[PDB]
Design a binder for these strands. Sequence first.
DNA 1: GATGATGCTGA
DNA 2: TCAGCATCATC
Lengths: 202, 196
Amino acid sequence: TCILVGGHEITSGLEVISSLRAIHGLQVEVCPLNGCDYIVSNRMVVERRSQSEMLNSVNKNKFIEQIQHLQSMFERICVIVEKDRRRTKSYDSLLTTLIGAGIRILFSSCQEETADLLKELSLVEQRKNVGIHVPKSEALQFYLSIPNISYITALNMCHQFSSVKRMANSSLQEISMYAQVTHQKAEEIYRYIHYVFDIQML
Amino acid sequence: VHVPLGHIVANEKWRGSQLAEEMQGKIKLIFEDGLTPDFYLSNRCCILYVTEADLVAGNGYRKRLVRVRNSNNLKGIVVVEKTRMSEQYFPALQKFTVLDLGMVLLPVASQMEASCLVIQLVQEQTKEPSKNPLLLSEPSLLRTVQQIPGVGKVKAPLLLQKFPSIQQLSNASIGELEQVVGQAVAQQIHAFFTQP
DNA sequence: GATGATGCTGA
DNA sequence: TCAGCATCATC
Ligand SMILES: [Ca+2]
Ligand SMILES: [Ca+2]
Ligand SMILES: [Ca+2]
Ligand SMILES: [Ca+2]
């Protein structure tokens, strides 16, 4: 399996990343992910969060907004709650909120454990036939600009469309198949590429 | 099991427990014998409580999680005592519960913690799912057009004025592009769209 | 995440 | 032709 790692995790999870690389048969690619900590399949993101930051309610709003931004790009989300190198109402409320919105939660005691959980998640995603199965850069930058598209979906577009023109003239079902996204997601991408630009709307 | 709104149905074995007593001072507990799960929060949503002694004893606790998982009309939430004593056994339980069975898992350190957390869950369950904070393209189009080689803040709006969707811009010939930009940039744009 | 210093674009 | 324009490296 393949996992994509946000560049910013080189600062916050150096040992997560080296633990991932220490797992035989895992392809670990660090990428400019823009907020996303780990991408473990074509459809699933993982947010790694420190438990002490989950416990403080002044962070509650920022955490919610990061999850909202993840829901606009990914069909599936896991939160890994990781212990740092007293339990509160804010924290409990966060956990239940996540559960009500179907966001999966895992609990880790250290960065080595997090890596092992990330590996396990990618293995289970793989068995659900949504494994990452792809390796020009101008075209990646173009696809990445489509609103609410993930880095993996953009990479799928690069690798499965033989030209950018071929992608822009793709039906709703072609986008869904080649970009590896839900009908809802292919519709939003199709609507974007068909949207009639009007200057006076700025 | 019938669970009236604002009530928890508890397995009779919880009677007189700190857990039940802490909940009973905030919400109505109804006690019922013969139940597989520990608590029902609604007709379809139940709690499977795994004690420190269950976790340390081995994998016998799994049999009940499977039995609930295989129930069509039920969603099990696993609440596990993750303490100094039990914590080494937690990682294999989480793998089985969440990654194998796909069930929700919540660790607590104690019955006191469980009590607060169960009330939070009933509270979550009881509200309109729309009060869950988790439940115009022109500026973006400019930015997308700016990703085409040769195209900056000035050519992007000129291009979109004449070729008003990405699809239409993607289909433009060099001759048509030359109505908006020079021959060099018309060639860049067209190569960008059409090259393998 | 901003100038603005650098060299292509363009009729 | 020469400002205009895009681009990116360096604050
Ligand atoms: Ca994070
Ligand atoms: Ca009876
Ligand atoms: Ca540009
Ligand atoms: Ca021209």
